[PDB]
């Protein structure tokens, strides 16, 4: 399903993910769309930083969710 | 207390409905006012807001002061002079009790009691050597402060809990007697046993032995001497051999000894009064001290308090 990712320091994009996908996979997709490696990407949602080891299901991230990127 | 304009207007409008009652207890002379407040025992209505009773309380607070100053119990901050251990006349004792008991009843049957502002009158009267007045004041103080632990915050309008002098006096009162003691024979004796014939009063409680450090001032009084001397005589004797600061403490211990010196009706009544004052002091200190502070100050020093309390409520 589709997800919304706004770059606070850049532009906004949309991605496709699955509930089981880890935040590391999301960061890898962000790198593919932009280029910055996951280590430098900072992911924020609902006022809490997103951890690579976790996943969307653990964070309860739903469809059309809007996340924030700091780079 | 400070009320916002809307709150003040609402309180005034509410009190407008109690005007006949206020006129009932305010348009009468002092003896009639006393005989009228003493006739208010049961509440046939929901808990009245204490604000509507402000005119009455002040009047009572006016009279109590006249008795506090008459015996000089009012401690003057301008003077380092202490308060003499002088008993109150029986007439004045009844006069003060008639109003203190009514204050207890009123505080029991009202809410929004933070408006209660007498505060210092109770502090002054606590210095009275007579133990009935001490019991009444401790009862009123215990009913208060219970709100201050239920809410733990909020404007209170007396704030007497902060004072360290009152804390020290209450701690001394709560430690009067011991919930459990080891008699000479070695058999445990708890204060509850005072109401059963299966045991005898420990000889330690029957004799007075007070020691204070300035160089060590000692007052010793055997059972026979306590029986011969009156309570005021004992206070006079101790006052002549001890520094001022210790007098209050002595006034407790002596009063305890004279209570247990003989098994007379007056002594038994004084025993009951002292025990009730001890329980009320425990209740009060439980509300103006942190749990660890209470354990370190009272329960560790008096371990058998809980067992006696549980045994006394059946």
């Amino acid at each position: 399903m589709q997800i919304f990712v706004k770059t606070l320091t850049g532009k906004t994009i949309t991605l496709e993910v699955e509930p089981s996908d880890t935040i590391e996979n999301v960061k890898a997709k962000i790198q593919d769309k932009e280029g910055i490696p996951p280590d430098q990407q900072r992911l924020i949602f609902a006022g809490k930083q997103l951890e690579d080891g976790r996943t969307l299901s653990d964070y309860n991230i739903q469809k059309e969710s809007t996340l924030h990127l700091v780079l | 207390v400070l009320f916002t304009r809307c709150e003040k207007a609402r309180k005034e409008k509410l009190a407008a409905g109690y005007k006949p009652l206020v006129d009932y207890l305010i348009d009468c002379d002092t003896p009639t006012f006393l005989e009228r407040i003493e006739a208010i025992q049961e509440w046939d209505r929901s808990r009245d807001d204490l604000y509507v009773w402000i005119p009455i309380l002040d009047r009572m607070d006016g009279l109590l002061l006249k008795v506090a100053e008459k015996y000089k119990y009012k401690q003057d901050p301008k003077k380092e002079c202490e308060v003499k251990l002088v008993e109150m006349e029986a007439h004045d004792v009844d006069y003060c009790l008639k109003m203190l008991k009514f204050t207890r009843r009123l505080l029991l049957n009202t809410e929004n009691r933070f408006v209660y502002s007498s505060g210092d009158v109770l502090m002054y009267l606590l210095n009275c050597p007579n133990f009935t007045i001490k019991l009444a004041v401790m009862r009123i103080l215990a009913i208060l402060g219970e709100r201050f632990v239920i809410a733990r915050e909020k404007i209170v309008a007396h704030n007497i809990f902060g004072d360290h002098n009152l804390r020290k006096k209450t701690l001394k009162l709560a430690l009067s007697l011991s919930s459990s003691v080891m008699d000479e024979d070695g058999e445990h004796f708890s204060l509850v046993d005072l109401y059963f014939d299966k045991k005898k009063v420990p000889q330690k409680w029957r004799k007075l032995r007070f020691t204070h450090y300035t160089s060590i001032k000692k007052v010793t009084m055997t059972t026979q001497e306590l029986c011969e001397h009156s309570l005021q005589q004992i206070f006079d004797k101790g006052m002549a051999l001890l520094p001022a600061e210790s007098w209050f403490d002595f006034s407790i211990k002596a009063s305890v000894a004279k209570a247990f010196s003989d098994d007379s009706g007056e002594n038994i009544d004084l025993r009951n009064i002292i025990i009730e004052t001890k329980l009320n002091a425990i209740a009060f200190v439980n509300t103006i001290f942190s749990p660890p502070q209470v354990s370190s100050k009272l329960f560790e020093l008096d371990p058998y308090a809980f067992n006696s309390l549980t045994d006394l409520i059946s």
Binding site: - | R5, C6, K8, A9, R10, E12, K13
Partner: protein, 637 residues
């Protein structure tokens, strides 16, 4: 069943009863009740019409329940006079509460508190309340807010706060629902006070009329006006609330209703300051300090009117020691006057700011209206300053100077265009004359050591003179440094028939410097400022003069051969020529096009042929002997 039986009507009808309204407490509980009604409307859209109809019906019915509950001003038993008359009088010293509290004890008071809390809750809901503008004209909504004969404390009450929230919500949603109606209400209220505003300026209106019902009537009118002004300044006209639509609405109002409002506000502030001064001159000092109006709930004290204490204000606890009927009446009067003055000053500052808040682009009509408003406000301020002589009115003059400084500044940097109009009308020359007179008066002061220890402002002549002089010198200094003036564009924005385009701020900076330097030289010629053998001037005054010298000798990159008077009707395309053409018969659009094409030049002859024969005759007849009044003219020395 609910719809047919009209239970929704019963959900509101009980708010017209004082007992139920008081029980609802008019706070939190009433807001929750309003939100609950809004949620009821939301859950059952079928009930939205009924709920709105019931709300409108109760709003319409509420004014009928108002009545003259009681009286707020009471004559003194000893002399049957509301207010003191001599500084040596005596005080009855009653035991009553020092400050009266009437609003919450009135039936309509608590009723309005609760009803406005309910309305605030419904607005918080953001549901059905959005439909009250329909089938409820604002002329009826305002009928409950601005009731006749309110208490002196009405403008500071929970009802007014809730009404402010509700009106802010409505204004944000419906921009033009009520602004015109509230402005009309304010103007009509000011008109009703014509007797009080136009009274002689040499004596106190109230003290002259003391002991008559006219005092009570005027005080009730002033209380209503104070409520109106508080609403206007808090909701509609505020520097923070000045939106583009708001500025356009103000322009439209002043275009289609005239400028009588500005004159009425000037008269209001002038008379309020005069009343405060005169009243303070007939009460014992103890009452003066006992009836200071400054500690109002949510005023903050900043801004005019300036407060002249008698005891140091950093001590506190100065109020409530002594009370009496006259003391309470004086307290109410002073509170009302203070709030009126403060709100009038805020309104004048907002009027002088207007579009410059947003820097939005303006059409010719909007620019002309803005400059007209500036001209009216500045001329009214200058008239206010000129009205009263400086002898014996030092507190009033100090308040006036503080008001002028506050009005001509941005929350501070000078407002360049209003200040330019102020200079063109002779305001700075008046300030210079006042400064010289105050300097001569200061030279008469017996000692100056005390003047350097000014922990606060008193009624002493020396300290008042020092404060007035310092205020005037500070205002003069702020108009000479380009760092503290709004950077408005050059005069080319306004005129085309000019010799040279010059930056308005820098161009204005020159004449002020010339006047200040001439004044300093004249003072030197009197052997007062310099050449003295003693410290004849306090430190603050000399520091201000040194700052003036430093600014005067600072350089600005313009030459400013001469300055052109700024007139609203002469802004290109000038309204005078357009109006003349309309009188002739030509449409305004054609006149504007011709003026733009010809570069602001009158048609000497009909060779262009756009004037009809009769039109040409009328044009030649109506021009007048003088054609110089249709072009900007240089400003005289």
């Amino acid at each position: 069943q609910v719809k047919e039986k009209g239970l929704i009507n019963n959900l509101f009808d009980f708010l017209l009863d004082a007992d139920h309204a008081r029980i609802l407490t008019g706070g939190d509980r009433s807001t929750e009740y309003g939100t609950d009604i809004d949620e009821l409307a939301r859950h059952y859209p079928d009930l939205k019409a009924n709920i709105v109809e019931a709300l409108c019906n109760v709003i319409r019915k509420m004014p009928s329940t108002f009545r003259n509950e009681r009286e707020f001003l009471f004559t003194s038993p000893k002399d049957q006079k509301y207010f003191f008359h001599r500084k040596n009088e005596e005080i009855l010293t009653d035991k009553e509460e020092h400050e009266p509290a009437y609003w919450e004890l009135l039936d309509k008071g608590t009723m309005l508190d609760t009803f406005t809390s309910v309305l605030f809750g419904m607005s918080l809901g953001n549901g059905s309340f959005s439909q009250v503008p329909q089938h409820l004209e604002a002329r009826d909504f305002l009928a409950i807010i601005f009731m006749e004969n309110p208490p002196y404390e009405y403008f500071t009450s929970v009802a007014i706060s809730n009404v402010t929230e509700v009106l802010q919500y409505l204004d944000e949603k419906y921009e033009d629902y009520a602004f015109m109606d509230v402005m009309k209400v304010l103007n009509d209220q000011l008109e009703n006070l014509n007797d009080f505003l136009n009274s002689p300026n040499d004596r106190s209106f109230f003290l002259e009329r003391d002991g008559e019902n006219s005092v009570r009537s005027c005080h009730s009118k002033l209380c209503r006006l104070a409520a109106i002004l508080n609403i206007v300044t808090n909701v509609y006209i505020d520097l923070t609330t000045l939106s583009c639509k708001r500025i356009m609405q103000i322009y439209s109002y002043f275009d289609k209703r005239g400028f009588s409002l500005i004159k009425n506000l000037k008269l209001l502030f002038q008379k309020c300051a005069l009343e405060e001064m005169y009243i303070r001159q007939h009460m014992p000092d103890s009452v003066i300090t006992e009836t200071m109006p400054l500690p109002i709930v949510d005023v903050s004290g900043d801004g005019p009117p300036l407060q002249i204490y008698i005891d140091d204000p950093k001590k506190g606890d100065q109020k409530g020691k002594i009370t009496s009927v006259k003391t309470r009446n004086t307290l109410q009067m002073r509170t009302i006057l203070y709030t009126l003055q403060s709100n009038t000053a805020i309104l004048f500052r907002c009027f002088l700011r207007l579009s410059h808040s947003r820097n939005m682009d303006l059409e010719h009509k909007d620019l002309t209206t803005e400059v007209h408003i500036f001209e009216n406000v500045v001329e009214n301020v200058i008239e206010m300053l000129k009205a009263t002589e400086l002898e014996g009115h030092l507190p009033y003059i100090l308040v006036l100077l503080n008001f002028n400084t506050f009005v001509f500044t941005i929350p501070e940097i000078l407002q360049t265009i209003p200040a330019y109009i102020f200079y063109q009308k002779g305001g700075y020359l008046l300030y210079l004359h006042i400064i010289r007179d105050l300097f001569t008066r200061m030279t008469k002061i017996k000692d100056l050591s005390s003047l350097d220890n000014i922990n606060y402002i008193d009624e002493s002549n020396g300290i008042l003179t020092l404060s007035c002089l310092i205020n005037a010198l500070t205002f003069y200094n702020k108009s000479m440094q380009t760092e503290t003036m709004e950077n408005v564009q050059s005069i080319g924005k306004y005129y085309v028939s000019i010799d040279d385009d010059y930056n308005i701020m820098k161009a204005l900076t020159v004449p002020i410097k010339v006047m200040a330097l001439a004044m300093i030289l004249d003072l030197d010629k009197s052997d007062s400022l310099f050449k003295t053998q003693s410290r004849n001037v306090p430190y603050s005054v000399f520091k201000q003069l040194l700052s003036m010298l430093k600014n005067i000798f600072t350089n600005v990159n313009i030459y400013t051969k001469e300055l052109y008077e700024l007139h609203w009707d002469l802004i290109f395309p000038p309204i005078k020529k357009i109006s003349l053409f309309e009188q002739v018969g030509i449409p305004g659009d054609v006149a504007a096009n011709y003026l733009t094409d010809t570069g602001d030049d009158l048609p000497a002859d009909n060779s262009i042929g756009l004037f009809s024969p009769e039109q040409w005759e009328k044009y030649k007849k109506l021009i007048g002997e003088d054609k110089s009044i249709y072009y900007p003219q240089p400003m005289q020395a």
